[PDB]
């Protein structure tokens, strides 16, 4: 019975509540179909309500369930947003409890893994200032969690990318390119690459932030993994705002890049004339 | 699946518990561990997390698989990493270490003989709830072994920190600390008394006044294991004022709670 | 202005036809909402029929448009399937025209990038036997394209993975592990990893095929890129279903 659990989300019996929660986390896993069934049973209102709980045991598992639900499709992500989860998630980003912070960042990043509609909701909720603050954290675990969420946000449209820039993320990112920690370097380059996958305005901001000297320095690295990550980002920078020459750090991006080469031709037909005509009008 | 479990009920639950062990063993037979262990000394943090991921998966198999990890010499490196200020490296090593410690007594003893407890015990005082959870998990696994393994935990000085955490206003911390203590108290009377001497009973009794049914259920299991000891142990429980609260709970509205309070008053018989 | 072009997909004037075909491709490359507008205008039946065209110029741009439509959500992918495109698509995998072959493989990969229902439709249409044979190709461009489509199929459920195994993909994948071409190596490991991300049965097939000896050898590589790829695959195998 699924409604029994949903009912039991309002139970004052913490033992009966915790069982319905962890079981819901189990149901939320296993595909968007089970996710949708949870959504249809009307659980989200009570779920989000528990995000204000001072009971870390309940809060944790609650965030766990919301994250699973948010791992579904954009439609299923949007239901989470509609339920009103973002404002509570954003405030939890200031928590001194690293356990809660991870769960909050996990849920928030899954929401930011959807469409620009979902990404923009994250931005409109005020999540970027907190995320940027965390980039200065000496906790490598917190740092990864924050970059993961920022990366997903920077994977959207140019306006989303620009929001990230205006939030002051680039200075922290550039400083991390000097880290001797290859794991931090990967995470930082991942985020940068998504940011460099925007328009000329966005790319120029990366340059103005002093990213190139560090990227250039890494081209000499004997670490093939660093090399790929550095080249990826620099390649996006050298794209000139042309999204057919950019690739967001996601599966299928390089394959798509190759396919677009054999179809930019008719798109390159009109650039060459724009070049000749503009020159002939010197 | 393991949760959902004349003799066919036995054999099914085997197939579940061991599902995947044959695959993990092939990886071992192929000779993957020497290289993985070699990679644990790398200063490249990206390689480290990748090697620890694979190693943890291997250590998720059966005791034979776990023992192969030990025989390959993984513990010295893992132990070294428990003192890292890199919270990312720390989580990865504790994960692998927990999986190893989730094995049999021989496996748990190897973890002990490698010198893991001192680092684990010192992390119990961490203000980082994330680290704390990971350290307790690993310690709970170690304390799930035999009396020798349990006593090693006690001799390492873990109980003082565990008793302190019982006063935590954090329910998640409380669950984690109670599970570890519940494992310590599942040993012989020597181990139960150590819990008693550490001052665990006063805090446990205080929790029996909690309105949180999940807390009660957690505290009831600890005392239950303490009440399985000898008359010296049962008595101390009575001294602390447990009987009072227990029978106050004899008629609690939660069915599962009632059986735990019942089964405890039962044990306190002699 | 959209139904006009759809009707022009049945035009006998090839220049009028090609012009409408190129703009549709451009609209479909502009997001799901633009993709749905095209579907709603009734373009799929006209596009699907152009998969029988003997005009390579038309076919390619029609494959290009369908590939973009297939880059949308699982709902928009399924419309392509329901329109009946897969049989004509799969048939093009036996083409000796590398230009047409690539475009066909991209469309299928996008289709196979949807839900397990979409992957299964690709399997039921008979796409696996062709893909497997292409793994023996000496053309590194074809090989990469075939390995991609296969990787998307192997990203589905254990049933989808098992279909790949039953088609005989593993023997070719294992041989590629010995390739000195790091690009081929990455492509093969990606596919192999997906297969190893299944149940114990699927994992055990990977073992029975002889993958471990090569994988273990790769762990000694000084190339950190190869190392990550090999560990990823090795980890999936050692997950225990």
């Amino acid at each position: 019975e699924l409604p029994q659990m949903v009912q039991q989300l309002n139970s004052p019996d913490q033992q009966e509540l915790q069982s319905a929660l962890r079981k819901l986390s189990q149901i939320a896993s296993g595909g968007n179909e089970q996710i949708q069934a949870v959504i249809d049973a009307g659980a989200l209102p009570a779920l989000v309500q528990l995000l204000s709980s001072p009971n870390e045991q309940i809060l944790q598992e609650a965030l766990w369930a919301l994250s699973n639900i948010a791992s579904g499709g954009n439609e299923q992500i949007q239901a989470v947003i509609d339920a009103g989860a973002l404002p509570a998630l954003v405030q939890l980003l200031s928590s001194p409890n690293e356990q809660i912070l991870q769960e909050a960042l996990w849920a928030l990043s899954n929401i930011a893994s959807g469409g620009n509609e979902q990404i923009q909701a994250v931005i409109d909720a005020g999540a970027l200032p907190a995320l940027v603050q965390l980039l200065s954290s000496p906790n490598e675990q917190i740092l990864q969690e924050a970059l993961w969420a920022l990366s997903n946000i920077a994977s959207g449209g140019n306006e989303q990318i620009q929001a990230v820039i205006d939030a002051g993320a680039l200075p922290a990112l550039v400083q991390l390119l000097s880290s001797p920690n290859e794991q931090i370097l990967q995470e930082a380059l991942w985020a940068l690459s998504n940011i460099a996958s925007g328009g000329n305005e966005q790319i120029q901001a990366v340059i103005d932030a002093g990213a190139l000297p560090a990227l250039v320095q890494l081209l000499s690295s004997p670490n093939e993994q660093i090399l790929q990550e550095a080249l990826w980002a620099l390649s996006n920078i050298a794209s000139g705002g042309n999204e057919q020459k950019q690739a967001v750090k996601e599966a299928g991006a390089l394959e798509k890049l190759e396919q677009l080469q054999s179809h930019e031709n008719e798109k390159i037909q009109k650039e060459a004339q724009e070049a000749l005509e503009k020159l002939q009008s010197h | 699946q393991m949760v959902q479990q004349l003799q066919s009920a036995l054999r099914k639950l085997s197939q579940i518990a061991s599902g995947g062990n044959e695959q993990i063993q092939a990886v071992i037979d192929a000779g993957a561990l020497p290289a993985l262990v070699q990679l644990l000394s790398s200063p490249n943090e990206q390689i480290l997390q990748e090697a620890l991921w694979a190693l943890s998966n291997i250590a998720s198999g059966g005791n034979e698989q776990i023992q192969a990890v030990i025989d390959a010499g993984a513990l010295p490196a893992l132990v070294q990493l428990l003192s890292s200020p890199n919270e990312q490296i720390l989580q990865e090593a504790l994960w692998a270490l927990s999986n190893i410690a989730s094995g049999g007594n021989e496996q748990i003893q190897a973890v002990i003989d490698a010198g893991a407890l001192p680092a684990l015990v010192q992390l119990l005082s961490s203000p980082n709830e994330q680290i704390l959870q990971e350290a307790l998990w690993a310690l709970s696994n170690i304390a799930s072994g035999g009396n020798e393994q349990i006593q090693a935990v006690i001799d390492a000085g873990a109980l003082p920190a565990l008793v302190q955490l019982l006063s935590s206003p954090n329910e998640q911390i409380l669950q984690e600390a109670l599970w570890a203590l519940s494992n310590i108290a599942s040993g012989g009377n020597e181990q139960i008394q150590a819990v008693i001497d550490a001052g665990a009973l006063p805090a446990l009794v205080q929790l029996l006044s909690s309105p949180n049914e999940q807390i009660l259920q957690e505290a009831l299991w600890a005392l239950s294991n303490i009440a399985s000891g000898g008359n010296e142990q049962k008595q101390a429980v009575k001294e602390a004022g447990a009987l009072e609260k227990l029978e106050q709970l004899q008629s609690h509205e939660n069915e599962k709670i009632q059986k735990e309070a019942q089964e405890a008053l039962e044990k306190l018989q002699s | 202005e959209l139904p006009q072009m759809v009707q022009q997909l049945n035009s006998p004037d090839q220049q009028e036809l090609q012009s409408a075909l190129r703009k549709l491709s451009q609209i479909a490359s502009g997001g799901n909402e633009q993709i749905q507008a095209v579907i709603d205008a009734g373009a799929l039946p006209a596009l699907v029929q152009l998969l029988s065209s003997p005009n390579e110029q038309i076919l390619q741009e029609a494959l290009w448009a369908l590939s973009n439509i297939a880059s949308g959500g699982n709902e928009q992918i399924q419309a392509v399937i329901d329109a009946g495109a897969l049989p004509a698509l799969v048939q093009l995998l036996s083409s000796p025209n590398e230009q047409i072959l690539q475009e066909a493989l991209w469309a299928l990969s996008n289709i196979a990038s949807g839900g397990n229902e979409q992957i299964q439709a690709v399997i039921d249409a008979g796409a696996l036997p062709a893909l497997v044979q292409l793994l023996s190709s000496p053309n590194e461009q074809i090989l990469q394209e075939a390995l991609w489509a296969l990787s998307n199929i192997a990203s589905g459920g254990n049933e989808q993975i098992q279909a790949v195994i039953d088609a005989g993909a593993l023997p070719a994948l294992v041989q590629l592990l010995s390739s000195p071409n790091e690009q081929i190596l990455q492509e093969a490991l990606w596919a192999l990893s997906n297969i190893a991300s299944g149940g114990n049965e699927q994992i055990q097939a990977v073992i029975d095929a002889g993958a471990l000896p090569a994988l273990v050898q790769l762990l000694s590589s000084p190339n950190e890129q190869i190392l990550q790829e090999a560990l990823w695959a090795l980890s999936n195998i050692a997950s225990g279903g």
């Binding site: 944790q60 299928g252 | 959870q133 | -």
Partner: peptide, 10 residues
Amino acid sequence: RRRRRRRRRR
């Protein structure tokens, strides 16, 4: 019980 992990491709 509550332990989580994840990784990224391309």
